[PDB]
Design a protein around this ligand. Structure first.
Ligand SMILES: O=S(=O)(O)c1cccc2cccc(Nc3ccccc3)c12
Ligand SMILES: O=S(=O)(O)c1cccc2cccc(Nc3ccccc3)c12
Ligand SMILES: O=S(=O)(O)c1cccc2cccc(Nc3ccccc3)c12
Ligand SMILES: O=S(=O)(O)c1cccc2cccc(Nc3ccccc3)c12
Lengths: 115, 115, 115, 115
């Protein structure tokens, strides 16, 4: 599993559960092509988006539907979604964990790249 | 000034100077149309992107070109850029300050909205 | 003004107003001695804590009373307070801006140091 | 395991390994009494600090020696250490994960409280 997404709720101090995540890969004509999607689990995690074979070098975009999450909690948010755009590899494939720390008017995003 | 962007370097503890910023607005046909652009000053701030008249209701994307910034400092960062996507002025005109806190493998973004 | 504190509310996207701040300095006997205190203004900022003359070299602790802030807004937060502990002026006098970004179960803190 | 600490390096996008962590419990006379300590593992995690039996309600302080971490990497940091001060329980015991996201001049800290 080369790509994992994790989402935290900073208001409740909990995993952000059932958050939709859409992954896109940048095509040769500079457009965003749908690549993978899912929703975070009870632990706020999303695994099995892709495989090592399919996760080739290139620019990827991870969109996290933060607005719908806050809407379900009855809390007015600022952002439409959180966006994480990055180049897969320098490098030689390894494991990418993208984490998103959510607040209604702020978010932090981190990348842990491990062997 | 209804839209301001501020960028901080969390490695040096200093304003992030000369950071390129591109702003887009979502058109009726669902495409991102160029809206405004500029670079942060010596104080890490970018003003004068737009006017109250031109800053109508809509969905805006603020793209902060973080990769270029880090590379010039000799750092190969994770993200291509920081993205901040939000609905603006849907309850009348407001003033928006978008701040970004930059690390090579992480960023935080905040919004302060005033009436 | 060599020491400034700024506090942001990440739930409301606004300055955190009337937040109590206590500053301490480490004495030669290793105890924390009261150095200065105040509360953030309507802009979320606290100035005039000290002077260049009184702000000598040493280890300082800035205690930001975040729990009291959240409770008044009807929120039971995780942290008692945010702490920021740092050596100051060990390479000559500097100006320090300490910022805190507050969420109920998370905070970020930054420092901008200028000569 | 009622108390877990996790430390991330935001410059390298990696677990922060071999970071010293000291835990204190607030005594009746308002002093900090040493309670538990350790160093983060290769995964940047510290488990087995305490037991459910010993981890009674009260105020705790988790000190993360961030300065020594950056020093070993040859990077000049701002903070002496990161401090996380919190009340264990409202509530009825459960699991506390304290995470710290480290940059040389900034840190974020989060709490995930789970059943
Ligand atoms: O690791 S934990 O805090 O246990 C954690 C537990 C459960 C869900 C999480 C979701 C996103 C990030 C986390 N960690 C995190 C926190 C701060 C910065 C980066 C990642 C989550
Ligand atoms: O405010 S200051 O630290 O003075 C600051 C000074 C200079 C440049 C800054 C750029 C972006 C954000 C800041 N503040 C900030 C810090 C944390 C959260 C949100 C905004 C900047
Ligand atoms: O700069 S602004 O967002 O205008 C801002 C406006 C009003 C109050 C603020 C309080 C603390 C930090 C800020 N900025 C900040 C944001 C991110 C990182 C560091 C500092 C505040
Ligand atoms: O969960 S991961 O990113 O995989 C992660 C992996 C390895 C070490 C980590 C250390 C601290 C926080 C993490 N997460 C985190 C990130 C952002 C906010 C809160 C916690 C760590």
């Amino acid at each position: 599993c080369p790509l994992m997404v994790k989402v935290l709720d900073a208001v409740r101090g909990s995993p952000a559960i059932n958050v939709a995540v859409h992954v896109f890969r940048k095509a040769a004509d500079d457009t965003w092509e749908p690549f993978a999607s899912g929703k975070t689990s009870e632990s706020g995690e999303l695994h099995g988006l892709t495989t090592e074979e399919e996760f080739v070098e290139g620019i990827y975009k991870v969109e996290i539907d933060t607005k719908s999450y806050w809407k379900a909690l009855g809390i007015s948010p600022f952002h439409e979604h959180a966006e994480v755009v990055f180049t897969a590899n320098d490098s030689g494939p390894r494991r990418y964990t993208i984490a998103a720390l959510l607040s209604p008017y702020s978010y932090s995003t981190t990348a842990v790249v491990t062997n």
